[PDB]
Design a protein around this ligand. Structure first.
Ligand code: MG
Ligand code: ZN
Length: 802
């Protein structure tokens, strides 16, 4: 055993030892209890970043802990290979996105192997391979026939200069992000998952997830946005029917979640496309300009809750069916055509968005709810104005005194008996659009034929292979300009036809990869029946916060989809969720030639020859060039120091502040662990660890065993229930300090020192397995993973009798 700790010598050997023993190459073995630990698979962007290293070290700590406790642990790895960065890199460097993607994969794989993650590489998948995406094309065809996938027109944002479709995040002030050209809204046919058919299932099955964080469950309920409300019809007044046809000449229909405030409505509002807006704007050019300013804006929910809510009066009037009040119709920029009826009622006294709208335009505010002895101020909002659990009605005629629920049914009965309304349930959830006007993605298995229409490709002819000999050029998606791809025969009649050139949303590949890992070489289906039944569902999921709500919701959706097709038998994919905090770092800038700044990577900076300004700390990003390359951390201190610093500097949910001093401290603790064992072996070699009855031990050795087994208990709880690995490292450190302070020179003293060290190297093996595997083999000849997790000796926790 070498005196000094040298990670470059031991980490390659420990990895070859785990690979030769195939400790993490697991199969469907019904003898050991299964455990599926899943970390979110990475996009192959070129090389790992610090967020990758933290995510996969967390997942490896949890996997190695469960392995040491006797579980059949599956920790698979794979590559989320589709998406825009390969397409952008293809244009910047004139290479094929596939070649760019496969090069990044082979390099990033060696980086992951160099970190010693106990990963079943026999289950590796790359989603850009036909071996993978043929199965999401398969499910597509199956759901297309059943109607769960359907084709319908939808409005996108067309950049006429870049000749490409833009995401709303890429539209700034009505113009394209990279061109500045005014976007044009275009109606094109696109494909959708009828996810609204599963809204109730997606909401109620959250009750099964006893171990999910409540806020994550709350965020899924707000996205779905279920409400039980009331459809209400306001009859159009006799003086307001000009230009109106059909029912729009008869009544104005609205949806409301507060029909117990119907007596308090003071005006109504309609979308800019509502026929009442069309008819009223006919002879009024101010309303025409307002309708156009609405129709040329962004409808994104982010760009709607932040926007100035504005409106214009129309001069048309409708009648409140419950009290005969004559209410004016306004056009409003927050009412959206396509969300329900395209019209709403406004109760400024009990809706904060209506309160602010009415305060702006001096519209009336009619209190119809009372809460205790609270005074009502019509010029200042209070949160009790919106109170529903304690609301008693006032100024409501024969409804005064009722609470929310009995006023709801009273109003329902009143409206229904006169035909002017009925209860209704709605969801904010929209159908999932999966058409992408992009090349580097999974082709949509639709063939367009004039005789037969939109026809799905037969299962025999799957996959529809995306050609990889393509370099995109940024003037439209390449597939649409490639006849050798889209020219084909119709599968129903054999005549000339045209393939779908759009590709799928990449959220699709991430919605089911956790099932493909169970049998990634299976060629008869998405997932083999045997392997899906054994592995069941993901026991632990570790990932990031970016796009998490949509990713989770989509993966739950696909699970129920695949279950109903007979592929899986579980209802929910993820039993536990751990979202890691970001990794932050300081920023450094130097002013520009004309009132600006410029940021430089921290590695290329002289800390403590020109002076550079130390700015502020933020997430490691290319925006201010503060991303510390993890490869330079590995080369400098070894993989164990990299893993130790990430697990020690912060709890996994908390943000982790990069510290050069922190990394040095981590590496210095590893040398201490190494030197602690070495000095122990050079003073007599190894012995049999202490075990059994502990009476007759000295007061000092008894206390060391108490600290030992109390530390084992703390580390177990930190790994198993708290998932707080930083305090677990702190615990082992405290045990080592008590060790150093203890005379372990006697025969029984060495037996206790052996037990202290044999436990310490096993308590830290999930965090730093290279040095722990190496130190363990110098103390003990048995296999570490068969010695298992250190057990708690409760007899050593029973203090003396005084
Ligand atoms: Mg349960
Ligand atoms: Zn045909």
């Amino acid at each position: 055993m070498q005196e000094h700790y040298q990670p470059a010598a031991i980490e390659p050997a420990a990895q070859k030892k785990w690979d030769d023993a195939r400790i993490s190459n697991v199969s469907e073995d019904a003898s050991k209890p299964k455990y599926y630990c899943l970390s979110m698979f990475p996009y192959p962007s070129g090389k790992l970043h610090m967020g990758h290293v933290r995510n996969y070290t967390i997942g490896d700590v949890l996997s190695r802990f469960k392995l040491l406790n006797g579980f059949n642990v599956m920790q698979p790895m794979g590559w989320d290979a589709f998406g825009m960065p390969a397409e952008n890199a293809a244009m910047k460097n004139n290479v094929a996105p596939a070649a760019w993607t496969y090069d990044n994969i082979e390099y990033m794989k060696t980086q992951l192997k160099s970190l010693g993650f106990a990963v079943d590489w026999e289950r590796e998948v790359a989603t850009c391979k036909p071996e993978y995406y043929r199965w999401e094309q398969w499910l597509f065809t199956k759901l297309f026939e059943k109607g769960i996938v359907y084709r319908k027109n939808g409005t996108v944002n067309w950049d006429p200069v870049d000749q490409t479709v833009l995401a709303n995040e890429q539209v700034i002030d009505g113009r394209g992000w990279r061109s500045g050209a005014l976007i044009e809204k275009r109606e094109i046919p696109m494909y959708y998952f009828k996810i609204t058919d599963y809204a109730e299932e997606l909401l109620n099955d959250l009750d099964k997830l006893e171990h999910w964080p409540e806020q994550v469950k709350t965020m899924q309920r707000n996205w779905i946005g279920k409400s039980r409300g009331m459809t209400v019809r306001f009859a159009v007044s006799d003086d307001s029917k000009q230009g109106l046809e059909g029912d729009y000449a008869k009544f104005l229909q609205v949806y409301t979640t507060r029909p117990d405030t119907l007596m308090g409505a003071t005006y109504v509002a309609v979308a800019a496309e509502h026929p009442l807006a069309t008819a009223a704007a006919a002879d009024k050019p101010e309303l025409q300009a307002f309708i156009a300013e609405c129709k040329a804006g962004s409808v994104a929910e982010a760009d709607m809750a932040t926007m100035e809510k504005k409106g214009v009066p129309t001069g048309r009037y409708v009648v409140n069916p419950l009290n005969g009040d004559k209410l004016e119709v306004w056009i409003a920029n927050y009412v959206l055509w396509g969300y329900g009826d395209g019209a709403v009622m406004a109760v400024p006294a009990h809706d904060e968005r209506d309160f602010e709208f009415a305060a702006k335009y001096n519209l009336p505010k009619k209190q119809v709810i009372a809460v205790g002895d609270n005074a009502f101020d019509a010029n200042r909002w209070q949160e009790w104005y919106g109170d529903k659990e304690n609301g008693v009605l006032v100024n409501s005629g024969d409804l005064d005194g009722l609470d929310f629920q009995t006023a709801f049914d009273a109003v329902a009965a009143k409206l229904q008996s006169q035909g002017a309304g009925e209860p209704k349930t709605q969801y904010r959830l929209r159908d999932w659009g999966i058409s992408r006007q992009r090349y580097w993605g999974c082709p949509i298995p639709i063939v367009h034929c004039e005789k037969c229409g939109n026809v799905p490709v037969p299962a025999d002819q799957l996959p529809v292979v995306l050609p990889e000999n393509v370099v995109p050029d940024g003037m439209g998606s390449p597939l649409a300009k490639m006849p050798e791809f889209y020219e084909t025969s119709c599968p129903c009649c054999g005549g000339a036809a045209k393939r779908e050139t759009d590709t799928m949303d990449t959220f699709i590949e991430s919605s089911w990869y956790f099932f493909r890992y169970m049998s990634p070489k299976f060629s008869d289906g998405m997932v083999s029946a045997e392997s899906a039944k054994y592995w069941g569902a993901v026991d632990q999921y570790i990932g990031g916060i970016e796009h998490a709500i949509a990713h989770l919701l989509y993966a739950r959706f696909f699970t129920k989809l695949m279950r109903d097709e007979g592929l899986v038998n579980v209802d929910e994919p993820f039993e536990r969720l751990l979202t890691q905090g970001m990794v932050v770092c300081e920023t450094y800038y130097r002013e520009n030639d004309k009132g600006g700044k410029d940021w430089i990577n921290p590695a290329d900076v002289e800390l403590t020859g020109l002076p550079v300004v130390i700015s502020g700390t933020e997430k490691m990003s290319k925006s201010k060039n503060n991303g510390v390359d993890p490869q330079e951390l590995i080369n400098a201190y070894g993989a164990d120091t990299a893993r130790l610093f990430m697990m020690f500097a912060a709890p996994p949910e908390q943000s982790l502040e990069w510290s050069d001093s922190g990394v040095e401290g981590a590496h210095r603790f590893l040398r201490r662990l190494w030197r602690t064992v070495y000095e122990y072996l050079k003073q007599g070699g190894a012995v049999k660890a202490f075990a059994g009855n502990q009476d007759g031990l000295s007061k000092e050795l008894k206390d060391l065993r108490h600290k030992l087994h109390s530390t084992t208990a703390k580390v177990s709880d930190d790994y198993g229930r708290r998932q707080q690995f930083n305090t677990a490292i702190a615990a082992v450190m405290e045990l080592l300090n008590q060790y150093d302070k203890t005379d372990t020179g006697s025969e029984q003293g060495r037996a206790v020192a052996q037990e202290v060290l044999e436990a310490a190297v096993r308590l830290l093996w999930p965090i730093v397995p290279h040095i722990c595997e190496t130190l363990w083999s110098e103390l003990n000849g048995a296999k570490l993973w068969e010695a298992g997790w250190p057990t708690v000796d409760e007899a050593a926790l029973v203090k003396s009798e005084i």
